Design a protein around this ligand. Structure first.
Ligand SMILES: N[C@]12C[C@H]3C[C@H](C[C@H](C3)C1)C2
Lengths: 25, 25, 25, 25
């Protein structure tokens, strides 16, 4: 729904940032 | 308004992350 | 405060994504 | 919990964006 989709997009952003931080380390 | 603009900025962040994930794949 | 700081960090994320989208265009 | 984890992922996204902005400057 319109509420769960916004949370799903936020989870993807966190996973992408985690990968980048791991590459910089 | 001040509430819809914050959601609009969040949607843009998710679209940008999706493109990056597609490039890495 | 603990509520305004979370919004301030979100605004920075949107500005960073906007710059990236402008570079890709 | 399910509420604190979502905030923790958001904090990581802000730190990653701050580093990028510092590199561009
Ligand atoms: N709420 C957030 C949406 C998007 C991804 C992540 C970091 C920024 C940009 C704020 C959580």
């Amino acid at each position: 729904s319109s509420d769960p989709l916004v949370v799903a997009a936020s989870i993807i952003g966190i996973l992408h940032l985690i990968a980048w931080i791991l590459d910089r380390l």
